[PDB]
From Swiss-Prot:
Keywords: Antibiotic resistance, Hydrolase, Plasmid, Signal, Transposable element. The gene is blaZ. The active site is at S39. It comes from the Bacteria. This is Beta-lactamase. GO terms for biological process: beta-lactam antibiotic catabolic process; response to antibiotic. The lineage of its organism: Bacteria, Bacillati, Bacillota, Bacilli, Bacillales. Its EC number is 3.5.2.6. Pfam families: Beta-lactamase2 (PF13354), LPAM_1 (PF08139).
Length: 257
């Protein structure tokens, strides 16, 4: 299609950044406008932890207590007073979008301060992590808190995971979680050809129909992925998103490759 046309059809704003890591070809559409990234950052936090903990050491346990629990933690809520491995923390965060798992992961890394320091090292001066879950979901068009642009997020995802310092084991581990989560089926996965493998992490903020999906797409025949970042939102605080918007956006963008 045409992205301008899909904005018109859905009455929404679209931010797209796609990079074929094989050729270096990019497709950009509103690639420098800020959007709340929400749960798509669970992918970033998980990758950052994996850079500092070898696969064989993922059995390390951390203690979970009452004070760690935040809203929507379908897995972690059963671990109050118990210990959980770092491996299961990552699985909870990526597969179930568990919010306590994500906050614990951020703490393991050293806090928001440390995540922000790592992004600067990667050269990402845009992604602005400020709050923990679930507060980071309170998006305001007038605040830069917990936002990034499709270009900056996409480049950070590429340098961290696609072309980064993760071991094979860890990289396969994270990518498997993304290939197998059912939460992204109505998104990028719904719009690309069946030929393609989509490893994604979706997100949704509480305000302005902020609905996102980021993924590593594997065309049939290519071993290097196409990093695809789709961020969308609407004009009213209480608007609900239509997942079809991202499905259609993904189909359209995939035509460029």
């Amino acid at each position: 299609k045409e992205l301008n046309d899909l904005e018109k059809k859905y009455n929404a704003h679209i931010g797209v950044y796609a990079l074929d890591t094989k050729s270096g070809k990019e497709v950009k559409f509103n690639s420098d406008k800020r959007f709340a990234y929400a749960s798509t950052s669970k992918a970033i936090n998980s990758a950052i932890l994996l850079e500092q903990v070898p696969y064989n050491k993922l059995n390390k346990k951390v203690h979970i207590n009452k004070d760690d629990i935040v809203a929507y933690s379908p897995i972690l809520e059963k671990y109050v007073g118990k210990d959980i491995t770092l491996k299961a923390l990552i699985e909870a965060s990526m597969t179930y979008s568990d919010n306590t798992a994500n906050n614990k992961i951020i703490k393991e890394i050293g806090g928001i301060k440390k995540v922000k320091q790592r992004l600067k090292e990667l050269g990402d001066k845009v992604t602005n992590p400020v709050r923990y879950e679930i507060e980071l979901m309170y998006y305001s068009p007038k605040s830069k808190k917990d936002t990034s642009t499709p270009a900056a997020f996409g480049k950070t995802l590429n340098k961290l995971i696609a072309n980064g310092k993760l071991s094979k084991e860890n990289k396969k581990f994270l990518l498997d979680l993304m290939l197998n989560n059912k939460s992204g089926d109505t998104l990028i996965k719904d719009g690309v050809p069946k030929d393609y493998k989509v490893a994604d992490k979706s997100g949704q903020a509480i305000t302005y129909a902020s609905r996102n999906d980021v993924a590593f797409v594997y065309p049939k025949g290519q071993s290097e992925p196409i990093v695809l970042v789709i961020f969308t939102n609407k004009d009213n605080k209480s608007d609900k998103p239509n997942d079809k918007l991202i499905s259609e956006t993904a189909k359209s963008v995939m035509k460029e490759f």
